[PDB]
Amino acid sequence: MSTFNAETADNLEDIEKQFAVVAVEQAETYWKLLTSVPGSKLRLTKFDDEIYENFMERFPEYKDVERVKKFTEEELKTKEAKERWRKFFTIFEKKIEDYNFGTLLRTDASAEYGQFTTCFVVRLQFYAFEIARNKHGLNDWIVGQK
């Protein structure tokens, strides 16, 4: 009920307002953190290890180094994948509260922070690919930047 707390949806542009600002800052924050210290000690969540494991259990297609590094927007935008991200959410709805907090994630791990080399995602999709890339060391090169 709009009279009570939560269920608060002002408009889609309001959703995209809070989303756009948090996403762009979250990206340059991640970048800054790695250029200082290696991504290994950086915990994405207090469930990061088991999020990685459930990602390779429910998606044994992704666990390949080449399927960990990069994705395209279109292969997420298929009905099958959208549903799969909802099933993937229903696993972590018990532990990851802010699954749809809004985050900027790069399409390819070894690609920079450019329009075509990045896509807009939720926190759940971010953590999934990010923890993966971190263990696989596909985002190692940020600690080697200047």
UniProtKB/Swiss-Prot annotation:
What keywords does the record list, in alphabetical order?
A: Cytoplasm
Has the keyword DNA damage been applied to this entry?
no
Q: Name one GO biological process term.
A: 'de novo' cotranslational protein folding
A Gene Ontology cellular component where this protein is annotated is: cytoplasm
> Which top-rank group of organisms is this from?
Eukaryota
Q: Which InterPro entries match?
A: PBDC1-like_dom_sf (IPR023139), PBDC1_metazoa/fungi (IPR008476), Polysacc_synth_dom (IPR021148)
Which one of the record's GO molecular function terms can you name? nascent polypeptide-associated complex binding
- Where is this protein found? Cytoplasm
Q: Which residues cross the membrane?
A: none
- Would you indicate the residue range of the signal peptide? none
- Does the record's keyword annotation contain Cell membrane? no
Q: Which family would the database say this protein is a member of?
A: Belongs to the PBDC1 family.
Task: List other remarks.
Answer: Present with 37500 molecules/cell in log phase SD medium.
Q: Please report the name of this protein according to its UniProt entry.
A: Protein PBDC1 homolog
**Which organism was this protein described from?**
Saccharomyces cerevisiae (strain ATCC 204508 / S288c)
